[PDB]
Design a protein around this nucleic acid. Structure first.
Ligand SMILES: [Mg+2]
Lengths: 50, 50, 49, 119, 38, 50
DNA sequence: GCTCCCAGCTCCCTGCTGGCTCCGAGTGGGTTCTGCCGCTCTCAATGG
RNA sequence: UAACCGGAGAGGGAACCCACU
DNA sequence: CCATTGAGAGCGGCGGAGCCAGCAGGGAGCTGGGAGC
């Protein structure tokens, strides 16, 4: 019964499908994105990426 | 009923002014998540106003 | 059942919200009025369409 | 009696080596000095003090909290701490069926007194 | 925050709730109840 | 002795590697002679509370 | 010796399983836990 | 034609159960 | 003054769920040696 604005669902479904494949919201989806190592070491794995 | 809240104190004029212009409590009444107030009248006062 | 589900709820949803923020924290609205991320790839052309 | 078996095997491993270093000189061996008293007296006192149900050399491999400090805060917490059971299932368990109140705990286990945390 | 804050108050068969939010977030190849609506 | 050098370096390898990674799969963890394993450099920054 | 047939060969992909990582914020208090034996060098007490 | 004193952030680590929202 | 040596003290030892890597089992189709000229 609750309601979330639409802006916030469009934005999540846009980041998930923005690079042409399905980017999961796990460590295998967002760490394979090329964001730069100091940002990936903060989510998970923390040294494997460094 | 035993809840505890923390209290941070901004330590500069430039952080004080920023909190005062961006996070003060009457500025936060309407949420952008569902575009409705987050604060309402809710106990004893709501029963007595009815 | 309600006491069991409260105690598993608390720890299972707090991890969804963390995975979401790490995946989207740097998406913001530029002065271009377009919605980009840290690599400046354009995510939405206008906020919320 | 799970402890006192391992602690009684360690001291037969001690009186063994002590009979050994002593018959091989061909001298004769004495046991008063072979009986290491600090095997029982300290293994018991150790596991009953930390709670780890094992030896001190392998204590990260043991059970834990088998032995807790009695709660003297009101008489009803003393009395309930002494009659407390424990299902050893780990935490970080997303399963429910061991946390549900089974029909079969009727009259045996109190159906109302449980901790409301993760245990 | 707007998708995680309501998520904390949620719970033939369609596995709604956080078990479903987790299948959508982690694009999972084997979901629990994969139906069609023909 | 051209044979012991092999064991010397095998143990040097064990030490220099468990300095930077104490958890190895299928390898004895370097413990202190109190009986507790070490906190390698990878553990100082591995997970939560890194 | 010529042209052309065929199994063995060569590489291709598809599929199962082992290995690795993660598992909510914060807070208070508590109690237990910094390796243990022993074999040589040194000191200055105490024997002649 | 006279009159006694002067120094200052100290400081500690590892592990476990119980409890609170 | 002379002196072997106990004692002091210090250092050398003695749970569960989900992605990628590896492998094995398995076809397309090439090329040398045979087949018929
Ligand atoms: Mg409350």
């Amino acid at each position: 019964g609750s309601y979330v604005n639409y802006r916030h669902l469009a934005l999540l479904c846009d980041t998930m499908t923005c690079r042409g494949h399905l980017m999961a919201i796990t460590r295998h989806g967002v760490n394979r994105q090329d964001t730069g190592p100091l940002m990936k070491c903060s989510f998970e794995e923390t040294v494997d990426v460094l | 009923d035993g809840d505890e809240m923390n209290l941070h104190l901004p330590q500069s004029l430039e952080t004080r002014a920023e909190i005062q212009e961006l996070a003060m409590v009457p500025r936060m009444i309407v949420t952008p998540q569902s575009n409705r107030p987050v604060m309402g009248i809710v106990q004893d006062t709501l029963t007595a106003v009815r | 059942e309600g006491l069991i589900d409260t105690a598993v709820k608390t720890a299972e949803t707090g991890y969804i919200q963390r995975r979401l923020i790490k995946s989207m924290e740097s998406v913001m609205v530029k002065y271009d009025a377009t919605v980009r991320n840290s690599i400046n790839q354009v995510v939405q052309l206008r906020y919320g369409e | 009696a799970f402890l006192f078996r391992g602690m009684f095997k360690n001291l037969l491993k001690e009186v063994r080596i002590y009979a050994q270093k002593f018959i091989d000189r061909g001298k004769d061996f004495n046991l008063e000095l072979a009986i290491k008293t600090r095997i029982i007296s300290d293994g018991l006192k150790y596991s009953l003090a930390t709670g780890n149900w094992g030896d001190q050399k392998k204590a990260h491999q043991a059970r834990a909290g088998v032995s807790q400090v009695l709660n003297r805060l009101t008489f009803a917490s003393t009395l309930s701490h002494l009659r407390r059971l424990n299902s050893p299932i780990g935490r970080d368990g997303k399963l429910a069926k061991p946390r549900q109140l089974h029909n079969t705990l009727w009259g045996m286990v109190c159906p109302a007194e449980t901790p409301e945390g993760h245990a | 925050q707007s998708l995680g804050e309501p998520a904390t108050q949620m719970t033939k068969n369609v596995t709604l709730g956080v078990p479903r939010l987790k299948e959508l977030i982690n694009i999972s190849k084997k979901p629990k109840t994969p139906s069609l609506t023909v | 002795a051209a044979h012991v050098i092999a064991e010397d370096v095998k143990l040097l390898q064990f030490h220099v590697a468990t300095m930077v990674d104490n958890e190895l799969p299928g390898l004895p963890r370097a413990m202190q002679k109190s009986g507790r394993p070490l906190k390698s450099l990878k553990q100082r920054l591995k997970g939560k509370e890194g």
